[PDB]
Design a protein around this ligand. Structure first.
Ligand SMILES: CC[C@H](CO)Nc1nc(NCCCCCc2cccc3ccccc23)c2ncn(C(C)C)c2n1
Lengths: 248, 326, 826
C-alpha cells in the first residue's frame, strides 16, 4: 500500500554516500548545507514553512538512495524545492529558483548546476519522483505542535514561550536525519519536552490529566522517554557543535 | 513491494484502445498481463518541461492516495515507458497513472440516449455520489470540477468520482484565495459566476444538484455559452441574486456588473413539479443561491430521499444491450 | 473543414397521419395525408381522390388536426412539429394561385421537462376553445384559441398522473373535459379532469373509474348522441360514461394488437378498428331509446370486415371508401361492401399507393447493363415485406416483389445471377409444441428448401419454456433470381437463430463465390447474445450447400469482405478471418475496444467501425505485422444507425436522433492526439432515420462527360421510405451555394414561419448546434420554382471566387443553369 520512510540510526552507517568513502561527519555536513540551502532559497522566495519542510524531507529521503558524490546537493536541493512547491500549492517557476540560488551560492558552488542550471534541475525531477516512490504527501512536526498546544490551558505567555521555542527546535531538526528516524508526531512532542525542560515548565499541569506525569502519552501513544531523550540530545548537539546557543 | 511506484514498466499492460482524450489527456484502456485485470492508464507527459511534471497529475496522485471510499476512483499504481539506461537527462519517456476501468461515464450514457432512470436508480446513484463527496468534504478537499463526464458508473451500479485534477485543500477556519473559475459553465455555482474566489465546499453541492435535476429530465438544467446567460438561466429558475435571499451578494465582485434581465421570483418547485416530493426538496436545498444557506453533503444523506436508501440493493440503471441495437 | 451536399431522390412515402374535414373550402370534403415533413391535400370525389396541393414544412409533422372556430367559414389546420414548432394554417385560393397562410405560430418548448414515453399528443376541444398538448411527463400545456393569441402563447397545468397513455377531449360536457388513461404501480386507470381557462388549473372531473385493462392503449371520445368514452385494449373494449359501464371481450381481437381507430357515423354508432396483422374491424354501438326520450348505449359489438395493409391511420371518407394510411406497407383505398364476397370478405381493394416502407437494407446493381444502376431495396415488414427494384426513367420506376415476411439484408451474387435475402417470418407456439405460420411467405413458397442441422448449439443444456400463443421469429436465407424474382431456395436457420449479416464474395485462393451469413443465438433471457455462427454457403445448381461453419461467442452484427479475408464484428470484438486451403475460417487479428460493433465499412486497408454509443472509429490493418491499429476515433458520444466512408479522410455517420455528421482525420502530425482525434466537421439534421448507406447512383451515366460540380455518390435509405444522396463539393462551390442558401431563406416563405436554419440545426434532447458543412440541396433546388422577381432579388450582389475572376456577379439565368446541372445527379 504505502512505503516505509523511517530508518534506524544504525542504518545511516550504510547510506550510498558512506559506502563511496564519504565519512559520517561529511555526509552530516552535506545534509545541513543542502537543507539550509533549501530553507534559505525558499525563505527568500516567500514560501510557506510547510513547503520548505517538504522539500527538505524529499531531500533527506533522496540521499538514502543515492550518493552525494554523484548527485550535487544544491542541484538536488533546488529540484526538491521546485517539486515541493507544486506539491504544497505554493508553486514557483524553475528560473526563479535558479535566480535566487545564484544570489546565495558562490561561483564554485553554483558550478554544480553546470552550464545550464535550469536543465540540470528539471532533468532531475524524473529521478526525484521515482526515488520518493511518488509518495508526495508529507506531514510535519509543525501541525502537531499546534494541535497539541491548543489542548493546553494555562498561562497564555508561558505556553506561547513553549510553542515558539519548540517551533525553533523543529526548524533546527530539519538539518538532521531525525526526519528519517521518527514520525513527525514524535518530533512535535520531543520539542515540546525539550522546551519544557529548558523553561523549567511542567506541562502535565496544562493537560486535561494534570496528575498524568507522562503528559505526552495522551497525544502520542507508545513513546518511551528514551526516544524523546534521544531526539532532544540530537537537537541540542547542533547547538553545542556550532556557536549558537539554546533560544530561551 | 506494492508501494514502490514509478518503477514497474507499462510493458506489463496490453493496451486495448484509447478510451479518452481532452483536457484530462490521453487515457488508454489496458489489461495487466499478470493479473488479467482491466485498467485505465492516463499518460502524463513531462517532456514539455515548461513546468515539468503537470500539477493536474500531482494533485490527482497526492489526493487519490489519501482518499479511500467506495465512491472515489482508485489509482492502483504509476508505471513508466522503457527508460534510457544510465541517461536520465536524455530520457523523455512518459509516466502512466493506473486506474481501475469503469465501464461507462454518465455523459456518454446520457448523450447516447441509451439509459433510463427510475426513482430508485436515482436514489442508488445520488446516495453513493453524495457519500463520496461527504468523505472528501469531511477531509477538507474540494473537487471543483463536478460534471457528468467525471462521474463513472459500472454496470454493477457502483458510482465512483474521478477527475481530481483541479482539487485543493480547504481551510474551515481561514479564507484562502482560489482560482476564480473552476467548474464547467453548465455546472458552475452562482457564487463563482459572480467571482467569489473564496469559495466554500458548497460549490460542489450545487453541481451535484444540477445533476440530480438532470437525471430526472435527461437534459442539463442550465445550458449556456457565456457566464451572463448562465446566471440568467439560473435566475429564471432559482431567483435573481437579492440581498434579501443572499445577504453577502453585495460583497461579490461582479454583483453590480452582472445583472439578470429581471429580479425573478423562484419557480424551481413549479417547473420541477413532475419530480417526486422527496427529491424536489433535495433539489431546492442543493440549488440554493446563498453558499451559506446551501445544504452540506452530509445533510443530503440525512434527507427523506437518500437516508433510507439501502446501499446493498444497488439497482443498476437500465442498460440498453441488444434491445436497443434491434 | 469538409463540404458536402445532401438531396432527396424519393421523398418520404410513409403515411404518418390522416384526417378529413373541410379545409380547402367549406364545401368540399378534403383528405389531408401527412408524410414526414410533407403535407398532401386531396379532395374526395366519387372515384377516389383529386390532388390539389402539396407543401413541405421545415419540421417533422407530429400533430395534425382540423378545427373550425366559431366565425370561420371553413376548417383551420393545426400542426406541431417534433421540434415543438406550432402553427395554425389556412388554405386560400385566388383563381389559379394556391397558397398556405400562416395564421399563428410559435415554439412551445419548455426549458425544463421530461419527454413522455407515449410521445407528443395533441387534441382540440369540441368547442374549439383550446388546444391540448401532452409534451412532458407531469404537465399538460394549454394553448387557448382566442383571436388575439397570434403567437400561440400557452401555460402549463400541473398533472399528478406522471405516466399518461392517451388523452382526448370528451363530448357533451358543461366545461372542457379531458379523459386520459394513466399507468401507476397499481395498474392503468381511466380518469377525467376539467380544464379552466379562467383559473388556469384542473377542477374535479365528471366521472372517475379505475381498473381498466393493464394494456389499455387508446381513448375514443364518443359523439353527443351517446357521450362518454371507449377504451381499446389488447383483450377488451370498454365504454365509460358516468355510471354506465359496458365491456366486450371478443376472442377475435386478442390475436392481434389494435393500433388505429376512426369514426364512421357522426352520431358515433359505428367505428373502424385496425390491428397489426392487417385486420379491419367495425365497432358497432347499439342504441336503446327509453320512453323518456333519451338514448342510451345498449351493447358493444365487434364484426370482422376483411384485411387491409398494416395501417398506421384510418379515415372513413365517404360512401364505403376508406383510406388505409400505412407506414409498413402500401397505403390504400379500399371499399366496404354491405354484402360479403364469396370468401366472406366485405373489403375490396380499389387503389394501391406505393410506400417504400421501412428500408432495412439495399444494394445498387446494374441488372440490364444500362451503365446506370438499379436499387433493390429490402422494404416493408411482416405481411407487407417486399423487394422494390427502383430505376430512374421524369419519374422513378418501382417494381414490387411481395415477400409476405420481413426482409433484413440483401446482397447480390452476379456469378449466380441471383440475390440473397435474409428474412424473418412470425410463427406462433401451437398445440403441437411446435409453431405455425400465420400465412405462407417467401420462405414457405420457395421452390427448393433446406434447414440447418448444425450441432454447434445442439449441446444445449439451456432450458427455455414455451407458452401457447407466444410469437417467435423464424429467420431464413432466400435465394431470389434477378430476371424472374422467383424465390429459388429458402434456407431456414436454427431455432432461436437470428440472421444479422450477409455478404457474397470469394475468399483467399478459393475460386468459388459464396454466400456468408452471420447469426446470433437470441434467447429472451439474455440481455446480449452470447452465441453465434458464421456460416459459409455455396449456391450451386439450384441447391444451397453448407460449406463451413465457425462458432463465435456473440452476435455477428456486421461482416464485409476485406482483401480476400473476412472482416466480422462479434459484439465488442472486431475480427479478421482468413480462408484456408481446407475451406475453414481462421482468425488473424482482433480489436476489443468497443461497446457494440454494430456497423463496418472498409476502403483499402482502412476500416470504419460504427458503435452503439461511441460514434465512429477508423481502424487499419498493418499487413507487415498481422494486426489492427487505431488510426482515429470520434470521441463525441453518438448513437449510430449507419455509417459510410466518403474518401480516405472523410467519414459519414447517421445518428438515431435523425441527424447526419461527417468526421475528418486531422492529418496534422504535430501531436499523436491530433491524429487520433476525428473532428466532427459536418453537422446536419436530416429529419429521417437512415438504415443503410450505399455507394452508387441511379443516374444514366454510361459514358463520362459533363460530370457535375458534385463528386462522389452515396445513396441512403430511411425508415420513412425516403431515398437520399450525399455528395462532396469543392471549397468554392460550397461557399457559393451556402451564400445562396442564406439568400434563399430570406426570400422563400416557410409554412408555419419556421426558420430554415433552425430546422437543419443538429438536434438531440441534450444538444442543438447550427448546421455545418452541408448544403441543403432541397433548398437549392427550390430556386428554380420561385417567381422571377424573387430570383433576381436572390442574385443581387452575388460574387463567386476561385474562378477565372476573383469576383464575378451572377445573374438569375446563370444560376438556373447551375441548379439544373445539380438536379441531374438524381
Ligand atoms: C475522458 C476522461 C475520463 C476521465 O474520467 N475518462 C475515464 N473514463 C473511465 N471510464 C469510462 C469508460 C467509458 C467507455 C470507454 C470507451 C471505450 C471505447 C470508446 C470510447 C469512446 C468515447 C468514450 C469512451 C469510450 C475511467 N476509469 C478510470 N479512469 C481514470 C483515468 C480516472 C477513467 N477515465
Amino acid at each position: 500500500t504505502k512505503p516505509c520512510w523511517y530508518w534506524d540510526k544504525k542504518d545511516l552507517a550504510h547510506t550510498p554516500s558512506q559506502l563511496e568513502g564519504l565519512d559520517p561527519a561529511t555526509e552530516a555536513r552535506y545534509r545541513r548545507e543542502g537543507a539550509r540551502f533549501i530553507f534559505d532559497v525558499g525563505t527568500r522566495l516567500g514560501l510557506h514553512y510547510d513547503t520548505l519542510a517538504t522539500g527538505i524531507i524529499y531531500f533527506h529521503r533522496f540521499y538514502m538512495f543515492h550518493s552525494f558524490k554523484q548527485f550535487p546537493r544544491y542541484v538536488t536541493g533546488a529540484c526538491c524545492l521546485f517539486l515541493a512547491g507544486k506539491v504544497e500549492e505554493t508553486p514557483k517557476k524553475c528560473k526563479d529558483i535558479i535566480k535566487t540560488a545564484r544570489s546565495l551560492l558562490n561561483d564554485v558552488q553554483f558550478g554544480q548546476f553546470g552550464d545550464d542550471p535550469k536543465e540540470e534541475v528539471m532533468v532531475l525531477e524524473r529521478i526525484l519522483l521515482q526515488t520518493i516512490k511518488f509518495d508526495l504527501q508529507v506531514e510535519h512536526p509543525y501541525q502537531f505542535l499546534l494541535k497539541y498546544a491548543k489542548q493546553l490551558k494555562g498561562d497564555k505567555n508561558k505556553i506561547q514561550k513553549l510553542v515558539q521555542m519548540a517551533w525553533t527546535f523543529v526548524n533546527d531538526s530539519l538539518c538532521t536525519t531525525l526526519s528519517l528516524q521518527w514520525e513527525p508526531e514524535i518530533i512535535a512532542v520531543a520539542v515540546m519536552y525539550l522546551a519544557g525542560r529548558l523553561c523549567k515548565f511542567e506541562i502535565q499541569e496544562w493537560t486535561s490529566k494534570p496528575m498524568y506525569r507522562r503528559w505526552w502519552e495522551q497525544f502520542v501513544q507508545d513513546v518511551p522517554v528514551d526516544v524523546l531523550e534521544d531526539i532532544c540530545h540530537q537537537i541540542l548537539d547542533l547547538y553545542s557543535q556550532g556557536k549558537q546557543q539554546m533560544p530561551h | 513491494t506494492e508501494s514502490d511506484w514509478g518503477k514497474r514498466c507499462v510493458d506489463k499492460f496490453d493496451i486495448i484502445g484509447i478510451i479518452g482524450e481532452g483536457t484530462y489527456g490521453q487515457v488508454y484502456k489496458a489489461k495487466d498481463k499478470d493479473t488479467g485485470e482491466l485498467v485505465a492508464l492516463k499518460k502524463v507527459r513531462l517532456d514539455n518541461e515548461k513546468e515539468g511534471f503537470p500539477i493536474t497529475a500531482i494533485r490527482e496522485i497526492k489526493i487519490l492516495r489519501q482518499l479511500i471510499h467506495r465512491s472515489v476512483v482508485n489509482m492502483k499504481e504509476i508505471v513508466t515507458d522503457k527508460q534510457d539506461a544510465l541517461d536520465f537527462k536524455k530520457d523523455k519517456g512518459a509516466f502512466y497513472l493506473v486506474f481501475e476501468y469503469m465501464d461507462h461515464d454518465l455523459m456518454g450514457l446520457l448523450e447516447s440516449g441509451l439509459v433510463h432512470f427510475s426513482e430508485d436508480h436515482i436514489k442508488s446513484f445520488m446516495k453513493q455520489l453524495m457519500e463520496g463527496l461527504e468523505y472528501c468534504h469531511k477531509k477538507n478537499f474540494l473537487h471543483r470540477d463536478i460534471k457528468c463526464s467525471n462521474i463513472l458508473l459500472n454496470n454493477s451500479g457502483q458510482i465512483k468520482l474521478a477527475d481530481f485534477g483541479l482539487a485543493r485543500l480547504y481551510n474551515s477556519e481561514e479564507s484562502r484565495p482560489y482560482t476564480n473559475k473552476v467548474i464547467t459553465l453548465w455546472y458552475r455555482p452562482p457564487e463563482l459566476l459572480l467571482g467569489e474566489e473564496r469559495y466554500t465546499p458548497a460549490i460542489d453541492v450545487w453541481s451535484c444538484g444540477c445533476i440530480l435535476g438532470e437525471l430526472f429530465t435527461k437534459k442539463p438544467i442550465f445550458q449556456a455559452n457565456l457566464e451572463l446567460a448562465q446566471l440568467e438561466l439560473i435566475s429564471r429558475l432559482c431567483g435573481s441574486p437579492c440581498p434579501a435571499v443572499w445577504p453577502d451578494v453585495i460583497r461579490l465582485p461582479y454583483f453590480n456588473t452582472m445583472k439578470p434581465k429581471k429580479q425573478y421570483r423562484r419557480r424551481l418547485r413549479e417547473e420541477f413539479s413532475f419530480i417526486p416530493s422527496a427529491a424536489l426538496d433535495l433539489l431546492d436545498h442543493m440549488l440554493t443561491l446563498d453558499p451559506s444557506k446551501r445544504c452540506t453533503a452530509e445533510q443530503t444523506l440525512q434527507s427523506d430521499f437518500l437516508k433510507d436508501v439501502e446501499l446493498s440493493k444497488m439497482a443498476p440503471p437500465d442498460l440498453p444491450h441488444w434491445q436497443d441495437c434491434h | 473543414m469538409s463540404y458536402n451536399y445532401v438531396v432527396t431522390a424519393q421523398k418520404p412515402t410513409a403515411v404518418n397521419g390522416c384526417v378529413t374535414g373541410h379545409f380547402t373550402s367549406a364545401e368540399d370534403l378534403n383528405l389531408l395525408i401527412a408524410k414526414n415533413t410533407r403535407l398532401e391535400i386531396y379532395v374526395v370525389t366519387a372515384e377516389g381522390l383529386r390532388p390539389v396541393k402539396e407543401v413541405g414544412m421545415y419540421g417533422k409533422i407530429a400533430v395534425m388536426e382540423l378545427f373550425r372556430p366559431k366565425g370561420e367559414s371553413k376548417d383551420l389546420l393545426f400542426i406541431l412539429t417534433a421540434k415543438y414548432n406550432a402553427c395554425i394554417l389556412e388554405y386560400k385560393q385566388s383563381g389559379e394561385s394556391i397558397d398556405i397562410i400562416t395564421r399563428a405560430h410559435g415554439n412551445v418548448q419548455d426549458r425544463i421537462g421530461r419527454p413522455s414515453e407515449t410521445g407528443i399528443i395533441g387534441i382540440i376541444d369540441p368547442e374549439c376553445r383550446m388546444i391540448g398538448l401532452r409534451l412532458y411527463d407531469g404537465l399538460f400545456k394549454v394553448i387557448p384559441l382566442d383571436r388575439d393569441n397570434k403567437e400561440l402563447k400557452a401555460f402549463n397545468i400541473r398533472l399528478e398522473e406522471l405516466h399518461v397513455i392517451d388523452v382526448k377531449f370528451l363530448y357533451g360536457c358543461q366545461a372542457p373535459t379531458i379523459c386520459f388513461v394513466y399507468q401507476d404501480p397499481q395498474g392503468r386507470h381511466v380518469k377525467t379532469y376539467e380544464v379552466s381557462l379562467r383559473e388556469k388549473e384542473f377542477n374535479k372531473g365528471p366521472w372517475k373509474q379505475e381498473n381498466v385493462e393493464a394494456e389499455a392503449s387508446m381513448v375514443i371520445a364518443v359523439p353527443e348522441p351517446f357521450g362518454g368514452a371507449i377504451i381499446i385494449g389488447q383483450e377488451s373494449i370498454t365504454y365509460h360514461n358516468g355510471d354506465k359501464y359496458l365491456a366486450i371481450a371478443p376472442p377475435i381481437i386478442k390475436q392481434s394488437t389494435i393500433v388505429c381507430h376512426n369514426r364512421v357515423d357522426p352520431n358515433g354508432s359505428r367505428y373502424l378498428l385496425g390491428d397489426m396483422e392487417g385486420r379491419l374491424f367495425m365497432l358497432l354501438l347499439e342504441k336503446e331509446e327509453q320512453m323518456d326520450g333519451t338514448v342510451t348505449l345498449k351493447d358493444l359489438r365487434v364484426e370482422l370486415l376483411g384485411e387491409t395493409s398494416i395501417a398506421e391511420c384510418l379515415t372513413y371518407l365517404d360512401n364505403g371508401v376508406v383510406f388505409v394510411g400505412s407506414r409498413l406497407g402500401d397505403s390504400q383505398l379500399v371499399k366496404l361492401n354491405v354484402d360479403s364476397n364469396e370468401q366472406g370478405s366485405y373489403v375490396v381493394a380499389m387503389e394501391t399507393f406505393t410506400n417504400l416502407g421501412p428500408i432495412v437494407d439495399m444494394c445498387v446493381v446494374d441488372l440490364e447493363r444500362q451503365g446506370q444502376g438499379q436499387l433493390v431495396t429490402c422494404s416493408g415488414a411482416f405481411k407487407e415485406g417486399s423487394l422494390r427494384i427502383i430505376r430512374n426513367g421524369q419519374k422513378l420506376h418501382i417494381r414490387t416483389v411481395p415477400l409476405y415476411e420481413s426482409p433484413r439484408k440483401i446482397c447480390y451474387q452476379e456469378v449466380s445471377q441471383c440475390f440473397g435475402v435474409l428474412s424473418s417470418r412470425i410463427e406462433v407456439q401451437d398445440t403441437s409444441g411446435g409453431t405455425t405460420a400465420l400465412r405462407p411467405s417467401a420462405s414457405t413458397q420457395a421452390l427448393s428448401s433446406s434447414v440447418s442441422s448444425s450441432k454447434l448449439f445442439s449441446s444445449s443444456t439451456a432450458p427455455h419454456e414455451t407458452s401457447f400463443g407466444e410469437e417467435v421469429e423464424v429467420h431464413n436465407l432466400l435465394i431470389i433470381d434477378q430476371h424472374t424474382f422467383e424465390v429459388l431456395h429458402a434456407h431456414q436457420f436454427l431455432q432461436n437463430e437470428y440472421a444479422l449479416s450477409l455478404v457474397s464474395c470469394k475468399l483467399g485462393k478459393d475460386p468459388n463465390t459464396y454466400f456468408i451469413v452471420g447469426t446470433a443465438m437470441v434467447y429472451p433471457e439474455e440481455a446480449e447474445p452470447k452465441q453465434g455462427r458464421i456460416v459459409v454457403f455455396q449456391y450451386s445448381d439450384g441447391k444451397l450447400q453448407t460449406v463451413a461453419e465457425k462458432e463465435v461467442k456473440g452476435a455477428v452484427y456486421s461482416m464485409v469482405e476485406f482483401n480476400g479475408k473476412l472482416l466480422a464484428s462479434i459484439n465488442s470484438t472486431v475480427r479478421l478471418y482468413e480462408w484456408t486451403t481446407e475451406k475453414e475460417l481462421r482468425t488473424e487479428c482482433n480489436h476489443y475496444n468497443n461497446i457494440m460493433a454494430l456497423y463496418l465499412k472498409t476502403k483499402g486497408d482502412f476500416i470504419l467501425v460504427g458503435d452503439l454509443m461511441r460514434s465512429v472509429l477508423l481502424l487499419a490493418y498493418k499487413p507487415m505485422e498481422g494486426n489492427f491499429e487505431e488510426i482515429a476515433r470520434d470521441f463525441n458520444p453518438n448513437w449510430m444507425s449507419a455509417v459510410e466512408i466518403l474518401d480516405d479522410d472523410n467519414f459519414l455517420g447517421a445518428e438515431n436522433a435523425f441527424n447526419l455528421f461527417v468526421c475528418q482525420k486531422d492529418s496534422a502530425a504535430t501531436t499523436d492526439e491530433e491524429r487520433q482525434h476525428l473532428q466532427e466537421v459536418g453537422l446536419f439534421h436530416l429529419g429521417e432515420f437512415v438504415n443503410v448507406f450505399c455507394h452508387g447512383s441511379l443516374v444514366m451515366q454510361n459514358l463520362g462527360e459533363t460530370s457535375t460540380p458534385t463528386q462522389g455518390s452515396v445513396l441512403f435509405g430511411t425508415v420513412n421510405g425516403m431515398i437520399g444522396l450525399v455528395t462532396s463539393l469543392s471549397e468554392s462551390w460550397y461557399n457559393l451555394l451556402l451564400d445562396m442558401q442564406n439568400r434563399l431563406n430570406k426570400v422563400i416563405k416557410s409554412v408555419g414561419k419556421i426558420e430554415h436554419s433552425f430546422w437543419r440545426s443538429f438536434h438531440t434532447e441534450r444538444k442543438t448546434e447550427p448546421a455545418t458543412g452541408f448544403i441543403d440541396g432541397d433548398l437549392i433546388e427550390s430556386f428554380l420554382d420561385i417567381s422571377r422577381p424573387k430570383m433576381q432579388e436572390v442574385v443581387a450582389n452575388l460574387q463567386y471566387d476561385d474562378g477565372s475572376g476573383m469576383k464575378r456577379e451572377a445573374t438569375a439565368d446563370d444560376l438556373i443553369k447551375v441548379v439544373e446541372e445539380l438536379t441531374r445527379i438524381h
